[PDB]
Amino acid sequence: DPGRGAPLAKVVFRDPYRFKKRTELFIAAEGIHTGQFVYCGKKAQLNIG
Amino acid sequence: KVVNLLFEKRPKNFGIGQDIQPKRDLTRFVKWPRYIRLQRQRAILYKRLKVPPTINQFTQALDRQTATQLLKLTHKYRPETKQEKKQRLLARAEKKAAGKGDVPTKRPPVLRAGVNTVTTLVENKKAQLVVIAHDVDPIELVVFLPALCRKMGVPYCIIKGKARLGRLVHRKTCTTVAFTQVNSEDKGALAKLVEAIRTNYNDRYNEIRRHWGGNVLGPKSVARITKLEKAKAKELAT
Amino acid sequence: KKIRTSPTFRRPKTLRLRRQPKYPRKSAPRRNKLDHYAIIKFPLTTESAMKKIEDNNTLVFIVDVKANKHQIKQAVKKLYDIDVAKVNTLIRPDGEKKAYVRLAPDYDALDVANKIGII
Amino acid sequence: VRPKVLMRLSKTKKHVSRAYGGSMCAKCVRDRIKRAFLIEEQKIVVKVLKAQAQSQK
RNA sequence: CUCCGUUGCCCUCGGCCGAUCGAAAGGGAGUCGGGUUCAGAUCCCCGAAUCCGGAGUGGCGGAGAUGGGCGCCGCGAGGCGU
RNA sequence: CGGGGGGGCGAGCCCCGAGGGGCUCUCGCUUCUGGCGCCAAGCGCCCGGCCGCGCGCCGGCCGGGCGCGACCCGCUCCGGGG
Ligand SMILES: [Mg+2]
Numbered sequence: 317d318p319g320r321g322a323p324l325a326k327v328v329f330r331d332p333y334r335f336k337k338r339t340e341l342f343i344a345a346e347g348i349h350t351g352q353f354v355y356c357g358k359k360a361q362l363n364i365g
Numbered sequence: 366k367v368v369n370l371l372f373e374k375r376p377k378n379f380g381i382g383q384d385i386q387p388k389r390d391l392t393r394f395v396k397w398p399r400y401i402r403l404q405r406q407r408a409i410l411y412k413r414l415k416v417p418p419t420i421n422q423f424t425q426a427l428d429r430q431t432a433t434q435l436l437k438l439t440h441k442y443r444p445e446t447k448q449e450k451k452q453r454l455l456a457r458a459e460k461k462a463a464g465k466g467d468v469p470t471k472r473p474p475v476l477r478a479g480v481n482t483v484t485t486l487v488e489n490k491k492a493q494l495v496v497i498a499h500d501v502d503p504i505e506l507v508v509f510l511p512a513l514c515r516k517m518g519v520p521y522c523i524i525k526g527k528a529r530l531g532r533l534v535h536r537k538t539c540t541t542v543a544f545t546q547v548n549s550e551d552k553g554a555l556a557k558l559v560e561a562i563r564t565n566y567n568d569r570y571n572e573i574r575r576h577w578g579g580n581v582l583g584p585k586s587v588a589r590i591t592k593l594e595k596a597k598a599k600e601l602a603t
Numbered sequence: 604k605k606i607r608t609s610p611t612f613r614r615p616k617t618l619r620l621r622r623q624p625k626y627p628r629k630s631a632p633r634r635n636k637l638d639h640y641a642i643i644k645f646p647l648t649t650e651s652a653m654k655k656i657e658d659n660n661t662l663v664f665i666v667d668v669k670a671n672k673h674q675i676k677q678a679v680k681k682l683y684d685i686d687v688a689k690v691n692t693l694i695r696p697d698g699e700k701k702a703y704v705r706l707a708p709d710y711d712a713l714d715v716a717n718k719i720g721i722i
Numbered sequence: 723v724r725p726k727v728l729m730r731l732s733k734t735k736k737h738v739s740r741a742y743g744g745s746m747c748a749k750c751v752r753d754r755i756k757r758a759f760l761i762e763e764q765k766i767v768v769k770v771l772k773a774q775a776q777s778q779k
Numbered sequence: 780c781u782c783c784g785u786u787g788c789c790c791u792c793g794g795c796c797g798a799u800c801g802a803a804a805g806g807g808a809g810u811c812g813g814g815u816u817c818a819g820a821u822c823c824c825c826g827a828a829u830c831c832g833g834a835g836u837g838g839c840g841g842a843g844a845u846g847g848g849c850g851c852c853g854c855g856a857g858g859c860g861u
Numbered sequence: 862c863g864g865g866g867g868g869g870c871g872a873g874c875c876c877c878g879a880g881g882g883g884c885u886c887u888c889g890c891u892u893c894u895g896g897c898g899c900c901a902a903g904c905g906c907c908c909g910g911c912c913g914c915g916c917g918c919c920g921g922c923c924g925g926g927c928g929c930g931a932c933c934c935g936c937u938c939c940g941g942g943g
């Protein structure tokens with residue numbers, strides 16, 4: 317993303333609720349490889365991304 | 366086997382992230398437009414705040430058992446409809462110039478409708494009963510009336526529905542109503558209500574006049590504040 | 604109990620009626636001003652137009668400037684009981700719309716010149 | 723070919739005749755196949771191991 | 780009034796994202812040889828083309844699509860019943 | 862969401878009869894792999910027609926409708942201040 321030191325990452329989840337696919341833009345944590353599943357939320361496990 | 370083997374089950378599971386969620390009713394998770402949101406949280410404030418006695422009395426009201434006798438009683442007694450009016454005049458025009466007519470008849474006793482009609486004939490002690498609607502919009506217009514009614518010693522009462530009170534008199538709405546006289550035969554039922562009403566109203570005033578009526582929180586807040594008194598009870602009741 | 608599946612309120616779609624006007628709002632309908640005598644003003648008789656009639660089976664017309672081709676076509680047809688293959692319009696520097704009208708092959712320009720009086 | 727041109731062309735010029743034909747590139751379909759086993763099968767292997775964990779417990 | 784069309788209402792489904800303008804150089808389907816004028820020419824004409832839209836009643840071909848089985852009758856090509 | 866209430870695989874405690882019950886937790890169930898996942902199956906309960914038994918909420922055929930599935934109630938659309 318121009319004018320910005322960090323690279324972004326597009327991460328496609330899917331809407332838990334409408335048949336579709338929400339996509340977002342997380343600031344890439346270092347070690348985000350492409351092809352990672354990224355777990356999100358309260359019960360999520362403690363690792364990178 | 367009257368059961369073709371193919372029709373199976375395919376039972377879905379809507380846990381988080383499992384199969385996609387179905388359609389619940391959401392009426393609390395929906396976007397209530399600016400009239401609704403607003404009218405919704407008038408009714409809330411109007412319980413949340415500490416409401417005054419004079420405005421409280423406009424909650425406590427009659428019950429089915431009493432109300433329905435009242436609205437029975439009035440139904441002998443509603444002021445002449447239009448059309449029904451015309452033949453009161455038209456019949457006297459034919460009866461005058463035919464078979465005698467001094468033409469006072471006897472004006473049969475009827476209701477009395479509006480406020481600045483009622484309040485005069487309450488300030489004149491010319492009323493057996495007064496019915497007042499609770500929900501009246503500027504409450505201004507009927508704040509006093511109870512106070513006034515009990516000072517004159519006139520049985521007042523607070524019925525639900527300015528609509529159904531304003532349906533006796535043939536209109537959209539009405540705030541007050543009154544029986545000044547009654548038909549002789551119909552006086553046992555009137556004096557039956559009157560004594561039943563004013564045990565419950567006119568002879569209460571220092572219970573009504575000093576009862577603030579809101580100061581009630583939200584059940585979400587109450588459930589939490591009470592859940593801390595099971596913490597504080599069960600700290601040193603155990 | 605007609606449950607809300609969606610968490611928006613969208614306005615209810617109401618009935619909405621059709622104009623049933625109590626009068627007409629102007630008395631009469633305006634008389635049509637682009638006619639089969641008005642849309643064509645005059646045929647040209649310029650040498651580069653006689654040359655165009657005789658050689659290309661056309662007729663060169665000055666035409667009312669708000670005219671379309673399907674108006675110029677159902678004009679020229681209506682009048683010089685003709686029929687028209689295609690119309691082809693420009694605006695002279697002067698504001699006069701020309702329109703040179705190819706007439707179907709069965710049918711001659713050099714005759715229909717003398718009928719309309721040009722030549 | 724420039725995309726509006728596709729409207730002129732015939733169906734068969736725009737795909738190849740398969741699953742995910744003309745959107746996906748063989749090499750990824752034939753992994754999408756044999757991924758779509760092994761996701762499916764190893765829900766069955768976890769399904770029975772779960773069933774044996776609750777039969778034990 | 781067949782069937783189709785059209786409309787009326789009743790039920791059913793639809794996230795969006797901003798009333799609108801902004802390219803003669805950005806995005807944007809499809810036209811080119813030859814001929815022709817004093818001046819115009821992918822413009823006119825001759826011939827070759829091409830895109831978009833319409834084609835309903837469907838204009839006409841071709842695909843869908845023309846097996847197999849079983850059972851008879853026929854020399855056999857074959858015919859019929861299912 | 863907050864309360865409530867189902868569930869129940871399971872843990873603590875309490876009870877217990879050893880069947881089980883209560884209170885507490887937990888869940889509310891998707892983590893090895895660029896895989897698939899909507900418009901509902903299943904059960905239930907009804908009604909229209911049509912066909913068969915003939916008593917026809919018996920049975921078939923055709924065609925619909927509602928309940929659970931997908932706990933119930935509310936009073937602030939969720940969050941943070943004050
Ligand atoms: Mg524009």
Ligand SMILES: [Mg+2]
Pocket residue numbers: none
């Ligand atoms: Mg351009």
